[PDB]
Write a protein that binds this ligand. Sequence first.
Ligand SMILES: [Mg+2]
Ligand SMILES: [Mg+2]
Ligand SMILES: [Mg+2]
Ligand SMILES: [Mg+2]
Lengths: 408, 407
Amino acid sequence: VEEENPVFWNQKAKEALDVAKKLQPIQTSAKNLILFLGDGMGVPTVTATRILKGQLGGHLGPETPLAMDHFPFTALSKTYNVDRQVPDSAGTATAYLCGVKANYKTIGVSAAARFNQCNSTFGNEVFSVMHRAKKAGKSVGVVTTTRVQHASPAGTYAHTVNRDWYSDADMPSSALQEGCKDIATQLISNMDIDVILGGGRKFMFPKGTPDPEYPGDSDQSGVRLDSRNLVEEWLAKYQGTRYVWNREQLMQASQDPAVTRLMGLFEPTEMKYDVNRNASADPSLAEMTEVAVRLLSRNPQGFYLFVEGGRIDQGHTAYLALTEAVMFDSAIEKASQLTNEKDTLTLITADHSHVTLRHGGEDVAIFARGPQAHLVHGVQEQNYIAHVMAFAGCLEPYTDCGLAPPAD
Amino acid sequence: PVEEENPVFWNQKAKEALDVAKKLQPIQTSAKNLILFLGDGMGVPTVTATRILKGQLGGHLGPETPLAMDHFPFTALSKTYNVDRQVPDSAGTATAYLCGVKANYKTIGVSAAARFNQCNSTFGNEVFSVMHRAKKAGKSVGVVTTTRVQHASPAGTYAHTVNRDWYSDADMPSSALQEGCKDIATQLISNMDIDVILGGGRKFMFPKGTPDPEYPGDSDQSGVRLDSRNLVEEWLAKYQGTRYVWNREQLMQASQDPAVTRLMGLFEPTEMKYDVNRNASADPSLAEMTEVAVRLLSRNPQGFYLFVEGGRIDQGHTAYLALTEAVMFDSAIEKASQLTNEKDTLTLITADHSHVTLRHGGEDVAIFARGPQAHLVHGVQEQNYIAHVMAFAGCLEPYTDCGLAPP
Ligand SMILES: [Mg+2]
Ligand SMILES: [Mg+2]
Ligand SMILES: [Mg+2]
Ligand SMILES: [Mg+2]
């Protein structure tokens, strides 16, 4: 009935005009960089999530704002790969994580490399913003609901001509002989990663190693054929490392002063849909985000954090897809509470689009808040995301940013 | 493309985009001129497919080639829902982006207190468009469309009706006529002074049986009015300096005539032909109509308000008709960019609602903006925000006390 009065709509517009007038750009560099990636979360998925979140909280739906709807800056992102108008998660990851567009099914390599051709990797590797943040002395983290070896998180640390090479068991012998390394091996050896949280236990352990939560199921066991225990090798890199596999272990590790580096692998492969998770054994995406922020924020140089709501497209009955998107929105709100807008650049995007009474390759929305977030505007190529983040953090190739540091 | 295999190519392209974003400064004055370009059903997927087609037409691969709209500095997402429907129609949305209030499905220029097809619910529930308030402030006003001028989107600038289908008196029940309700065609000539009216819809303006000037042998194309009114002759008699045109040759001559100060061009009995099927000598393109409207409207020292609709984009959606209409719509935006200065002109590009390989409904749409106060177009907004940004930038009611410096 309030909606039948023109005064209600005029007041709602006057409120929106007041937020726009108060909006000022933050002209400093960013100390912290956060990228939230919604897998297959294009414009239609964002709309359906807003409706569902609204309805869950006792509202009609479309009028209720999500945590992302409060981000001041918006842009459209062109997602095409160099060789395909309709892209995949691997090719897009190279663009938003490394700053160069690439070929379909390849990770952290330029479009000079060729899918499934192992020799084409060498001399064609491209380095992520996360890699450059580590080089500048920042702490780095990767948080995902998929396996940590999946295309999107793998974009922060790996270089591969084939996204399906999760472990040595997935690779042809010709590729191994040519010097190619599986994604699980690259996770522990390419660079120092301070925080790794998600799924993918089975790719880290020798063939037959029983899973700690599913010891009676052979399908959940270790798969490696090189007798390597990648978790034990990552733990031995430095003092202060900790490996966790359940929520109870995760919670204690987050408050432990001796823990400076953390690896949490919560399932043999993908983490369960939030709707089906065991609340005592399995941490939510919001819980993993809070733990990563608490651990990464101790570094006075700052941090780079990648957060993926990775099962949104995988679920897309729609109910699974939308409840993952709602949990993804609550992980954004959680990070907004633990960080200050004056020193933290937060970006929200999708890698690619998903393919009544009150078919792929489409552009996706980019949302931004914090220092240099006003550079996120108009219609941009997807690789622009990595460059705005490098520029705001004064990371290579933008050490010459010319930006004033933030306060504190 | 071999250049695309080099990381240097992508790094240089992003360094260039960074320089443009850093140089981008807000224009802090009011706007003298206001232009709204509306793409019928031109959501995010349609914009992407149009970019590919326009690119390919000009000899490129497609997705890398910018559209005229891709050069707009400011972007926002628009929530399109009607008060009573999550999936909206063109009538309800028009009230939001043209009047600034969200309304009910199938109604035009009335608040959600009015009820569909209930004539008595109109009175006291009328809402006034930004176009109407621009005219009240002394600006010149224009409506350019590829649909009939009585269609839901253009009708949103001048009409108040509880039923979008009341194009002429022949469409209305006798009970609604007796209650004081007026058809859309009648409201076009009587509600307000409109300086420029270009599009289709000849048949709704003439008495029953009046042969169409272009299709005199087709009874389906003849006048339909039952009140014996010739609405074109009435509109022409309102002021001195008026001109009525029905083909391209007459439009071009009217455009070059200094004695023409007001213009009505009705190019088809109903909707204008798809640009791809038009007779280049008899039918003007959307870009041609836009140039004529801008040239005529820009003479007023107080400024102007112009509404431009690429109205057949969703109607065509084989896809080829839809996409070629969207390409012509992009060229009308480029044409207006050449004839106006961004220092005194606020231009907005949007859609009313969304449309329902080798190199549903109710979804949010993109809003693109350039000019004074265009930086207020940001984030995720309700669709009615478009009308308020435009009223604020132009210092029109209810923002006469805008507090903005003149351009
Ligand atoms: Mg993913
Ligand atoms: Mg578990
Ligand atoms: Mg329309
Ligand atoms: Mg004609």
